[PDB]
Enzyme design. Structure first.
Site, short mmCIF file in Angstrom:
data_model
loop_
_atom_site.label_atom_id
_atom_site.label_comp_id
_atom_site.label_asym_id
_atom_site.label_seq_id
_atom_site.Cartn_x
_atom_site.Cartn_y
_atom_site.Cartn_z
N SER A 73 3.20 2.34 8.47
CA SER A 73 3.01 1.36 7.70
C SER A 73 4.56 0.91 7.19
O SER A 73 5.34 1.52 7.02
CB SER A 73 2.23 1.49 6.51
OG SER A 73 2.53 2.82 5.91
N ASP A 95 -0.76 -7.48 1.55
CA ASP A 95 -0.15 -6.18 1.95
C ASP A 95 1.37 -6.29 2.21
O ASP A 95 2.06 -6.27 3.26
CB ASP A 95 -0.64 -5.12 2.86
CG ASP A 95 -0.31 -3.71 2.88
OD1 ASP A 95 0.54 -3.35 1.66
OD2 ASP A 95 -0.67 -3.03 3.77
N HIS A 153 0.79 -1.26 0.15
CA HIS A 153 -0.01 0.03 0.06
C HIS A 153 1.14 1.24 0.04
O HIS A 153 0.26 2.27 -0.26
CB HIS A 153 -1.15 0.15 1.30
CG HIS A 153 -0.35 0.43 2.58
ND1 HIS A 153 -0.32 -0.71 3.56
CD2 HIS A 153 -0.16 1.67 2.93
CE1 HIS A 153 0.26 0.11 4.74
NE2 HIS A 153 0.30 1.28 4.36
N1 LIG Z 1 -4.67 0.92 15.32
C1 LIG Z 1 -3.84 0.74 14.30
N2 LIG Z 1 -2.87 0.14 14.76
N3 LIG Z 1 -4.06 1.51 13.33
C2 LIG Z 1 -3.36 1.51 12.14
C3 LIG Z 1 -2.56 0.38 11.79
C4 LIG Z 1 -1.39 0.61 10.66
C5 LIG Z 1 -1.51 1.93 9.90
C6 LIG Z 1 -0.53 1.75 8.85
C7 LIG Z 1 -0.78 3.26 7.84
O1 LIG Z 1 -0.08 4.35 7.83
C8 LIG Z 1 -1.67 3.20 6.58
C9 LIG Z 1 -2.54 2.03 6.18
C10 LIG Z 1 -3.43 2.22 5.05
C11 LIG Z 1 -3.44 3.45 4.39
C12 LIG Z 1 -2.59 4.61 4.83
C13 LIG Z 1 -1.72 4.58 5.84
C14 LIG Z 1 -2.22 2.97 10.43
C15 LIG Z 1 -3.23 2.71 11.48
#
Ligand SMILES: N=C(N)Nc1ccc(CC(=O)c2ccccc2)cc1
Length: 247
Positions: free
Chosen positions: A198, A97, A46
């Site tokens: 991420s 992913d 992603h």
């Molecule tokens: N409760 C959590 N741990 N929540 C959480 C987990 C992973 C992410 C990764 C990220 O930055 C992202 C994912 C998809 C699209 C854009 C950004 C973000 C928030």
């Protein structure tokens, strides 16, 4: 990372910082990643799906700060950007992913291991830690949901693995989470991964050995009760990893 502590790259030597070049000269942070071999970094798809041009990316190893240099850091170009062909994103969930980046310095070399640059071990076929196991995550992600900027110093925290039965409960994520994913959270819901984390590693000590068990993928909000962070289950992608890293 919500909560947790600030750390240095010496304590997370396998962490890779990935940036994207922009027209003009501005370089912004895109995602985290992990060095699994001298020439290979593993991250999340992603992160690159909207801009799959390898030339626009820069990878740093041995780096502790977001916008400043670190003694011993190494800069790399991306020789090959490999995204998973079956990647897809629903309302909340992101499937398959996972991504691979083959790196090379300007001289055409891969990473040279040091005190600040080390590889992390991959798991064995379907060999994950027992649920309830404590693991760590690392990243330059947001410290608070309301923040619009990322911390300047790398952070880390510890979270516990949650079973698929629990994570599939109605108040959690229901049937949106699959066996190709792993949920992890703080029993007090005080610490968690967040936007900007991420691609980063979920590292667990498996039989006295530090193993890359997950990749930060998705989650509802950040540090909310009954809403764990979700990670790509690395042990279920060993075939895909091996076939692509060969030649
Ligand atoms: N409760 C959590 N741990 N929540 C959480 C987990 C992973 C992410 C990764 C990220 O930055 C992202 C994912 C998809 C699209 C854009 C950004 C973000 C928030």
């Amino acid at each position: 990372i919500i909560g947790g502590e600030f750390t240095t790259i010496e304590n997370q030597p396998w962490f890779a910082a990935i940036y994207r070049r922009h027209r003009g000269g501005s370089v912004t942070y895109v995602c985290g990643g992990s060095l699994i071999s001298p020439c290979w970094v593993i991250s999340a798809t992603h992160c690159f799906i909207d801009y799959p041009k390898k030339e626009d990316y820069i990878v740093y190893l041995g780096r502790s700060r977001l916008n400043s240099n670190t003694q011993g850091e190494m800069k790399f170009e991306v020789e090959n950007l490999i995204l998973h062909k079956d990647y897809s994103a629903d309302t909340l969930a992101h499937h398959n992913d996972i991504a691979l980046l083959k790196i090379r310095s300007k001289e055409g070399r891969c990473a040279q291991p040091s005190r600040t640059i080390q590889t992390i071990s991959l798991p064995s076929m379907y060999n994950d830690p027992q649920f309830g196991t404590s693991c760590e995550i690392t990243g330059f992600g947001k410290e608070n949901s309301t923040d619009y900027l990322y911390p300047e110093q790398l952070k880390m925290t510890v979270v516990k693995l949650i079973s698929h039965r629990e994570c599939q409960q109605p108040h959690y994520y229901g049937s949106e989470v699959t066996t190709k994913m792993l949920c992890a959270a703080d029993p007090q819901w005080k610490t968690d991964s967040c936007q900007g984390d991420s691609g980063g590693p979920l590292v667990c000590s498996l039989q006295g050995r530090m193993t890359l068990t997950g990749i930060v993928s998705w989650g509802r909000g950040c540090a909310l009760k009954d809403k764990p962070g979700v990670y790509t289950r690395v042990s279920h992608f060993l075939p895909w990893i091996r076939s692509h890293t060969k030649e």
